Amino acid sequence: KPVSLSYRCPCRFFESHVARANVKHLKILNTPNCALQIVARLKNNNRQVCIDPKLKWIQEYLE
Amino acid sequence: DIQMTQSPSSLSASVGDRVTITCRASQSVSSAVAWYQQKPGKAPKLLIYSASSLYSGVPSRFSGSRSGTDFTLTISSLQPEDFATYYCQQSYYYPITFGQGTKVEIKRTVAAPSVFIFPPSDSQLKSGTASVVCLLNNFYPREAKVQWKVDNALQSGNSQESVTEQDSKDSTYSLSSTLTLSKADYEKHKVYACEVTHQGLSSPVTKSFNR
Amino acid sequence: EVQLVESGGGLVQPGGSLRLSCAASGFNISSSSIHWVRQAPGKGLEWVASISPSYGYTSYADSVKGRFTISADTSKNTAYLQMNSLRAEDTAVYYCARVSYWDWTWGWSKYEGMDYWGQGTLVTVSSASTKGPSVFPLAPSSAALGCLVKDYFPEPVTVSWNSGALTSGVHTFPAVLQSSGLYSLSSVVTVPSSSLGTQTYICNVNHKPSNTKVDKKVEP
Amino acid sequence: VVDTVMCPNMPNKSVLLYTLSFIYIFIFVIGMIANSVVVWVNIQAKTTGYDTHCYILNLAIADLWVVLTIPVWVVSLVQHNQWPMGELTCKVTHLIFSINLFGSIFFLTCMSVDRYLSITYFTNTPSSRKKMVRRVVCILVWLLAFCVSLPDTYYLKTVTSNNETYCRSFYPEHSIKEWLIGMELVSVVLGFAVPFSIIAVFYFLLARAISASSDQEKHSSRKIIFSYVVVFLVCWLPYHVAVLLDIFSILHYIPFTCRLEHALFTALHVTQCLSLVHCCVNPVLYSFINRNYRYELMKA
Amino acid sequence: QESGGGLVQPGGSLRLSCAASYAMSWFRQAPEREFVAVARRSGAFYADSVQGRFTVSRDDNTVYLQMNSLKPEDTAVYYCAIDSDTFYSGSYDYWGQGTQVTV
Ligand SMILES: CC(C)CCC[C@@H](C)[C@H]1CC[C@H]2[C@@H]3CC=C4C[C@@H](O)CC[C@]4(C)[C@H]3CC[C@]12C
Ligand SMILES: CC(C)CCC[C@@H](C)[C@H]1CC[C@H]2[C@@H]3CC=C4C[C@@H](O)CC[C@]4(C)[C@H]3CC[C@]12C
Ligand SMILES: CC(C)CCC[C@@H](C)[C@H]1CC[C@H]2[C@@H]3CC=C4C[C@@H](O)CC[C@]4(C)[C@H]3CC[C@]12C
Ligand SMILES: CC(C)CCC[C@@H](C)[C@H]1CC[C@H]2[C@@H]3CC=C4C[C@@H](O)CC[C@]4(C)[C@H]3CC[C@]12C
Ligand SMILES: CC(C)CCC[C@@H](C)[C@H]1CC[C@H]2[C@@H]3CC=C4C[C@@H](O)CC[C@]4(C)[C@H]3CC[C@]12C
Ligand SMILES: CC(C)CCC[C@@H](C)[C@H]1CC[C@H]2[C@@H]3CC=C4C[C@@H](O)CC[C@]4(C)[C@H]3CC[C@]12C
Ligand SMILES: CC(C)CCC[C@@H](C)[C@H]1CC[C@H]2[C@@H]3CC=C4C[C@@H](O)CC[C@]4(C)[C@H]3CC[C@]12C
């Protein structure tokens, strides 16, 4: 696709269901396009992945 | 299987004269034609391929043109080196179907044919088959007609015709026809006659002989 | 530098088989095709078949569909044509001709044609064998005179007049084929009317295939 | 354990954008003129008697559309990824671009196969039969390109985000990851991998075959044959390698850093510019070299 | 029917032609019939004794003979003849009357 018709920031897809216990490290990602974005890292697979930041306990833990 | 009608069959132009030959195609061919030349008893050459592009090597006098499905070959002027036959072609539908053929012979003044008849030799009677020959020499043009009549009765279905080619000196033709008859039938009749019809004669010339 | 030479020919009994060979030299054969064109005596040309040695794709003319197996052998860059069920209507001369396909002009090429031809070979299928000739005299009228030859085979026949002495005013008509299966030919030379009765004219005829020498005297 | 990267505002790269705009306008003018001339010469030549190969006409048409639909990208890019035009325009413009670009890429491979067959197999086939075959494959490749472009075009709708606007593709919520990666992979396997492999193999075989023949070597050359593959590779490699690298980054296989983001953005833009240069260089390689074409142009 | 004839000083000319009442022919008869010229569908031919002196054409229906450059040998009536054979064998079934010509 042409670059102009594309979206670029740490991640565009959110994992709908995430295990709270497996969560091990959340990175606050700040960009001028997607603004506030959250990057996590699950211990089950030990691979960085994003979660919908609008989850209730993410705000409680983060903000 | 595409018929490639080609005309005219024969032509006669003096040295250094323009001449054009037209070859036609019943169907439509996507400009895939050639034009070969053939001297008598020799391997035909190539002059024009594609539709109007000349082939390297041949003089620049020869050239071709296209018009719908009626191609034509153009000669600027005939030197005394291109008196041969030309065949057209199409290469857009297998099988390849060559044209009938065109003959371009030298032109000169008309000539008056002479007639001679040769009775069968005495030895020829021993073989059991009798033959007579009617001869025409140094006449013009190729076009000629001769018929056989015996005892004022027409003869047909049994005769041969053959003529030499253009003479390098006289530029004329000679025609010889042979009639073959059974020995028994030979004595049955008494009067043999050869009739010649030609554009150069007022009325047909009758040459006849008896035993 | 392209040269094509044919080989194989000669008379063959009716209903036989032939294998003609067209050896191509000076250029690899894979790129270009090979075509055979037929020419009966005194008639226009006609197409027969074509073979590409590259992958063996072939074609044929409807007139002879199924009777010919054109074969190619890229090993020796040669083309082979095998004939079968020969009939007494293929009497002709066969030329093997190339149709090149250049490559430096790929996208904008021109419809190509036959470029290099060979001398060809003569094929004459007949049911007869060597025989003749039987000279006979063409007596002059009580000037024009000559000689005749009839029932001879095969071609060609050499006619010489008075051991080559006479070369002016002599016409040797082309050979003719008779219904029975043999040929016939005539040769006539004109002489001055006064010359008649003063000079003896003898027609010398030779036939190499049967090496027969015949000499006949001509007189009124 | 948390990290808080406060990415600073992107430097004033607008100079880069202006520079890239200059390159695009040059490509636009050059490509339009060159491709139009090829089509004009090709259509005219038929009257003279030439055998104008259909692939060239179709390929020229494809490149003409691609280079004719560049200005829209320039307008969008000059505003730093924004979009002031209507949604219908976005859908139509992308559809035209994708169809034509894939059409051009496929036609290269089709041309290579046809050339090798012409020197080897088609030599004896009648002209009518091979003409029909070329027409049939021409229709089929257009249809295949049509099929390739449609899936992503249908999934296109704008958003408003601040107060800017964009034309960004929307993909199924339940399968966002699969659709994005799948779209970008088919852009590679059907866009770069298969066409390049076939083209390279067939032209190497052509080099061997032409070398074997004594007559053919003299008139033709053995450098242009390899030049085809080299030019295609240089023009179409950088864009795809950069995009594949970015895809790996999206999956978080690489650490994230501000320098990384800036480098990928500029690199992606630059390599896309080269991918358009491919269309400008295509006609000169495939037509202008032929002596017949130059002489035919000279006589008109 | 033939048209023309008259008296001409050497170096003159006169037009001869005949109209349909194929190929057309012209003859001469010196008060000894013989052949002078003939017209083809598309060229022409002339007797050796008349090479270039006279010219002929076939109008589509009349036929013209631009008899030019008289010489003191052409005093003879000229006739038109028709070759009834489509293949131009030379059979002259129909015979013309001609017109007197004298120089
Ligand atoms: C990479 C390319 C060359 C592979 C494609 C090869 C194809 C075209 C080859 C494979 C087998 C071949 C066929 C093998 C045998 C025959 C029989 C012959 O009497 C006519 C040609 C014909 C029918 C061939 C046509 C060409 C053919 C179909
Ligand atoms: C639909 C529009 C926008 C597409 C742009 C038009 C293009 C495709 C036009 C420009 C010139 C046209 C060609 C002009 C002449 C001919 C000759 C005819 O015997 C077959 C069609 C053909 C070969 C045309 C095909 C279509 C063509 C190539
Ligand atoms: C969204 C739009 C642009 C897609 C339609 C593309 C147009 C330009 C394509 C579609 C089919 C194509 C045609 C397909 C086949 C031929 C036959 C060939 O001998 C001349 C070109 C010609 C006539 C093509 C010209 C370009 C063409 C008309
Ligand atoms: C003959 C074929 C290759 C022509 C191209 C067919 C198109 C329609 C095919 C090629 C590859 C396909 C994609 C391959 C993988 C996926 C991932 C899946 O989770 C959703 C569908 C999706 C995104 C497919 C959509 C259809 C697709 C784009
Ligand atoms: C993704 C892309 C590369 C797919 C296109 C593949 C190309 C190389 C394929 C698609 C269809 C194929 C053609 C299908 C039919 C024929 C007819 C045959 O008698 C000769 C080969 C030929 C002409 C094929 C050549 C190869 C071809 C053109
Ligand atoms: C390559 C891109 C990025 C820039 C455009 C440059 C193109 C037009 C250049 C790159 C390499 C060049 C080729 C290099 C070598 C040759 C061999 C010579 O005997 C004919 C010209 C030819 C075939 C050149 C034509 C122009 C060419 C194709
Ligand atoms: C004649 C041909 C081979 C030259 C083309 C070479 C290609 C590979 C070169 C040309 C310009 C180059 C780009 C120029 C600038 C940058 C910015 C840097 O921060 C990352 C690399 C990147 C994005 C380069 C990648 C490689 C690149 C695209």
Numbering used by the authors:
A (entry chain B): 1 to 63
B (entry chain E): 2 to 212
C (entry chain F): 4 to 145, 153 to 230
D (entry chain A): 28 to 188, 191 to 329
E (entry chain K): 5 to 25, 32 to 41, 44 to 54, 57 to 74, 77 to 119
Pull verbatim passages from the article behind this deposition.
In contrast, ACKR3 does not activate G proteins and is intrinsically β-arrestin biased. One of the best described functions of ACKR3 is “scavenging,” whereby it regulates extracellular concentrations of CXCL12 to shape chemokine gradients and maintain CXCR4 responsiveness by preventing overstimulation and down-regulation of the receptor. To address these questions, we used cryo–electron microscopy (cryo-EM) single-particle analysis to determine multiple unique structures of ACKR3 bound to a series of agonists: wild-type CXCL12 (CXCL12WT), CXCL12LRHQ (a higher-affinity variant of CXCL12 with alterations at its N terminus), and the small-molecule agonist CCX662 (13, 14).
